[PDB]
Subunit: 23 residues, 3 copies
Amino acid sequence: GSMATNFDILKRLSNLEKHVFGS
Amino acid sequence: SMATNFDILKRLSNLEKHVFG
Amino acid sequence: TNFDILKRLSNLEKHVFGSKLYD
């Protein structure tokens, strides 16, 4: 929804995953 | 809902603080 | 879509904080 758009949620989730699972 | 959205944002933001500091 | 987000958050949290002794 618009919250996810306005807060860049998918981008941020993806980056977290890269750090967490990449480590 | 605001509830779902607050949960998402709190959880995401806290993980960012933890992982990135 | 908010559900894919919630699922990914729960998975992240488990990976970071869950015990690695649990299969």
